[model samples]
Target: SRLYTLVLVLQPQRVLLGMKKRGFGAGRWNGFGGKVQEGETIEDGAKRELLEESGLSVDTLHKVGHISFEFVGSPELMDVHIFSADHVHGTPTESEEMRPQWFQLDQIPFADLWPDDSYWFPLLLQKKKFCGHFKFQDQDTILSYSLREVDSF
Candidate 1:
């Protein structure tokens, strides 16, 4: 599986997410992320994705979770490293790729997110680190999974 990164912007009472405007997973709400480029560390790629998708430059990225996603009929897998940013250098803004928005922790639009998100996203709000694996039938069906809180990735 190729490595990728997902970054969620955390605030005192809110979390930032992007509405994917096009391409894969378009119409879904997700954290900013993509495949890590050559020579770029996962953390650096996470930060880059945040800035590119939401126009928010992160100052510090805290590694929070690692998840493996597999498609039921495909041999492909995605190893995603997730991070959290508490502070950023610029305001969140919509771009050609993503529409940036903040949701109160209690009001996250889970129906608009990936099928596996609600299973693990709550872990982030509790400030817990986690690792998980999921099997998906497609974009919306979770065939199976496991998730656990961990001290480190």
Candidate 2:
């Protein structure tokens, strides 16, 4: 399946705050996004989710990374496209599916987030673009992961 995740960097500070929708996924803290619809590009999907969830239109969204994961005991394999936006036009508002809020980068509660997120979030927060892969036995168990750093070259 194809998915898109929006990395919204808060204005001024550029701190990223992700949204969470109860009953959406096991990971509560996550970027604002959802599955790609038919005929939609990853960028379009990300922008759509961002507006739908947070009630804001983006001024800029740059694709920074991608990740693929193979799920064991399930036929689901996912290719996740990650897009980041440092500027947005409206204030954040929540949808029925998402509660929009902000937390400092250092104060993010990792334990409450997806296991994989904590692994890569640090790099993302540093304004470094990256791409990676991960294999998971289930929600909480990661079989393997690898990443490459960008933004320096």
Candidate 3:
């Protein structure tokens, strides 16, 4: 299956500013993305998702990691490819997919996020490149997980 990705950076005061909605229903604050359109590659879709979700047009974006997991005893596998960017333009704003916000690293509302994220999020904070695979009973309950550190190539 084709993959979509996102570019993220931490804000000052050790906060991670990700674009997302606000609740578990339609307001889930997951991240800034969706899926690739028909005949669209992940790279192209990445640009589209970024702009459409965050209002920022990315000039440069890089794929750095991926995560694969199952949801709540479902046969469907959720695969996510994470990306990053140091350069982009335009101010981020709220949309149907997300509402831009800054979250304190130490005071993150993990209660509202995917449970497995707490396990491996530290690596992202370190600015380390890596990929992970996770299995979950639901968004809040993780079953199994794995990660790989990527050496620059």
lDDT of each: 0.91, 0.73, 0.65
Candidate 2 per-residue lDDT, tens place, 1-153, comes to: 656565655554435455465664633777777788888877888888888888878866876677777778777767887777777878788687777777876777778777787877767767677888888887778898998887632
RMSD of each candidate?
0.8, 2.4, 2.8
Write the candidate numbers in order of decreasing TM-score.
Answer: 1, 2, 3
Query: Over the stretch 95-149, how does candidate 1's per-residue lDDT look in tens digits?
Result: 8989988999899999999989999988988989999999998888999999999
* lDDT accuracy of residue 88 in candidate 2: 80
Q: Count the backbone clashes (under 3 Å) in each candidate.
A: 0, 0, 6
Model 3, span 9-31: residue lDDT tens: 44544433454554432434455
* TM-scores for every candidate against the unseen true structure: 0.97, 0.86, 0.80
lDDT for model 1: 0.91
Worst 10 residues of 2 by lDDT: 10-19
